[PDB]
Design a protein around this ligand. Sequence first.
Ligand SMILES: Cc1cc2nc3c(=O)[nH]c(=O)nc-3n(C[C@H](O)[C@H](O)[C@H](O)COP(=O)(O)O)c2cc1C
Ligand SMILES: Cc1cc2nc3c(=O)[nH]c(=O)nc-3n(C[C@H](O)[C@H](O)[C@H](O)COP(=O)(O)O)c2cc1C
Ligand code: NA
Ligand code: NA
Ligand code: NA
Ligand code: NA
Ligand code: NA
Ligand code: NA
Ligand code: NA
Ligand code: NA
Lengths: 404, 404
Amino acid sequence: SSVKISPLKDSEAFQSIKVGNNTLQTKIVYPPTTRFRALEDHTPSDLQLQYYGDRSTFPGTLLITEATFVSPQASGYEGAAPGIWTDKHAKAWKVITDKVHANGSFVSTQLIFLGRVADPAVMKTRGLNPVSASATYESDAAKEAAEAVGNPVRALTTQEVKDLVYEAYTNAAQKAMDAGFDYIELHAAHGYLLDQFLQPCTNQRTDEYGGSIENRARLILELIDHLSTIVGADKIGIRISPWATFQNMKAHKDTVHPLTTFSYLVHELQQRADKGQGIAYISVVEPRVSGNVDVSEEDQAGDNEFVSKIWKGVILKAGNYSYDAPEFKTLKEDIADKRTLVGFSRYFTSNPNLVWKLRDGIDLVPYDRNTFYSDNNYGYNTFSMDSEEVDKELEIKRVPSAIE
Amino acid sequence: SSVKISPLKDSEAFQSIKVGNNTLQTKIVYPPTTRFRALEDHTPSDLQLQYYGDRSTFPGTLLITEATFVSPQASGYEGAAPGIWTDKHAKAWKVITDKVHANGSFVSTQLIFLGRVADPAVMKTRGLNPVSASATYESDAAKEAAEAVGNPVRALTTQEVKDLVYEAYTNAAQKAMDAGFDYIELHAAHGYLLDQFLQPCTNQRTDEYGGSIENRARLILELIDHLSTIVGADKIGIRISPWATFQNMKAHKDTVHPLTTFSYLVHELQQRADKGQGIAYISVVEPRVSGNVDVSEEDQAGDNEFVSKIWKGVILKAGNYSYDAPEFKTLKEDIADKRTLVGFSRYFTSNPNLVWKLRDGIDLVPYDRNTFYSDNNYGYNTFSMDSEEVDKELEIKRVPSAIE
Ligand SMILES: Cc1cc2nc3c(=O)[nH]c(=O)nc-3n(C[C@H](O)[C@H](O)[C@H](O)COP(=O)(O)O)c2cc1C
Ligand SMILES: Cc1cc2nc3c(=O)[nH]c(=O)nc-3n(C[C@H](O)[C@H](O)[C@H](O)COP(=O)(O)O)c2cc1C
Ligand code: NA
Ligand code: NA
Ligand code: NA
Ligand code: NA
Ligand code: NA
Ligand code: NA
Ligand code: NA
Ligand code: NA
């Protein structure tokens, strides 16, 4: 049902904050949210142009795009997710970032690489294997699926790992700049490739990229360092989900605990900040949520206070922040330090004007999980229309098309 | 001035708790507290026998002895601290543990090794150098002092590190058992030898005992493992002070943050517990105190929640727990999980019956920092006497003597 909320107008959520080179006028952020309304060849679509535009209308909002593939080897969904590796991709994204910018808002692109969870049939069509830090699967079913089509997961070679830094992510970053993104965000969360490198359940390498906490972090820090030299540290973010068990990450049951893995990473990031190479923000998933699933208090094994104690810069937190609506006690506590942003993903899907609703205490429209991942405009841009105007059957038939 | 306190009788502080093989009847503990009333040759004294006996009278209290040297190379104070490496040491300690036991209470011995902070003149009299993980000093003054007597700090060789495990600590553990101690506690806090191994500001080794988080922890875990095979894991504790800057530990300013170093260690301890080799307790210093110094809230850089999230066994916490007297809100919160002990060091010096006073809400007698470290009975056992009975000049003259 609809969520009654108290207005946040007079709260820290509407105090300006500098994030890298840009100043936000609200601390409410749209986090990366996969929806599968890109074109078949991963170019952003007409639907996406309106979708991001509709969420940019409170001037000075930060929007972070849905996970966007860095390269063909980075892909692996059956649904149509966007990419940022070709000039065509960048030119289409630029229409979208232009629209957000014309509203005085800002946009970060989340760069994803699927890794061991890439669909093996999809990858086979590209003549590629699913790849990872090590040759592992998230489940027996995943292993059987891959072996059945003769396309097993394999470990990247040392040279391939270098190629991620100097080729795949470098080109994605260059394309992101061509596309006018204000930031690029490394996806190091939720059991995808970079999280697979960081944690021991997924990384048993014996080269410089595994075999210790420091070695497992090496690829991620190499990307931070190299990409900082290309786009500047002020245009870089990173997302982590220390507590998540999404895609079979062991988290607090792994042989190295997330507090160890992620405190190591965050302290290395702060040391870079101390030397003048501080990245724009660290985005962290609160333990209330794991990937796209809520986690009971009983099941929660830690929290993200360590990030606040170790990192001195901007932090973005997300995960069921309306759980204590209408008064938003937890949100208010979490933004009290004046360097913290708060994200809403699921409610932003059904409330394109969410910043305005939270500002003025307007009831939140419930979201529709059934249309989170479908291929058409129904449950996508229809939340911007008066219900009386929406032709459902027409909109279900409205698949993504080229911009303009 | 005296501290008004509310009674803790009906609180979790007077619920029984199993710690290793023994059951305590109070959760109030006397933590290790150096006082320098041992004999010159480090044998425990008549004064110490009464001192520990006087603190054992609430049946089922755990007392932890003052830091006790594991070996001659472990020493380095000018004052007279006790040892546990000879039969003479063990026989004297056994008179003390017998007395505690006859009151139904229990006693752990804290095993210390000074390392880089050992007084270089004292060590020179033994024909030894101050030794450490690496050849470092806590200050320029310490370096100048050592070089001036031609006795610089030096790094232990790999073989010497093995000798700590198989000789120094093994023999101390065997003597501790001969002495009737219920537990041995590894001192891995406050900038002494084991803390010097754990943290990077003090350990730059290039053998298996330094050069990574795992390598720096290796000696400590080797001691836990080897000593568990000698005395049993149920007779082992360890003390850590993640946040302390005592003896120039860099703590949150080091190149690896304490949350990383100490979460690694504690999770490795829990993995041993999961396999049936769980140690009796982890003792942690709360960030209110660093060594023997209080730390302002402003200066506090983290907390010990991580220990509670990672370790499932008994935890002992200490550090200015009367700061929110009379109601003891923080103490009550911290023992609510039913597996946590709370220690008082400074107030136990001036209140030998502290468990009884806390039980029944009797005002605490102020402690006397001026006599914490002096060489005689004044301000030592005199707190057990009616003031009217105490002859001050006689007691100042009363230096430690042999038991019996
Ligand atoms: C439909 C959906 C798609 C998502 N896609 C992404 C994604 O592309 N990248 C990512 O880091 N997290 C993704 N997430 C996780 C969200 O960004 C967010 O952290 C999570 O939903 C919790 O926030 P919320 O309670 O406000 O929804 C997704 C979540 C959902 C429900
Ligand atoms: C005089 C004195 C001697 C101490 N000696 C030791 C010691 O031998 N080993 C140790 O681990 N801590 C030692 N400490 C630290 C205490 O065990 C304790 O953690 C600290 O005093 C904070 O607790 P409190 O506020 O109840 O005094 C000592 C502290 C003082 C004041
Ligand atoms: Na403003
Ligand atoms: Na999948
Ligand atoms: Na899945
Ligand atoms: Na915060
Ligand atoms: Na009892
Ligand atoms: Na000293
Ligand atoms: Na000192
Ligand atoms: Na507790």
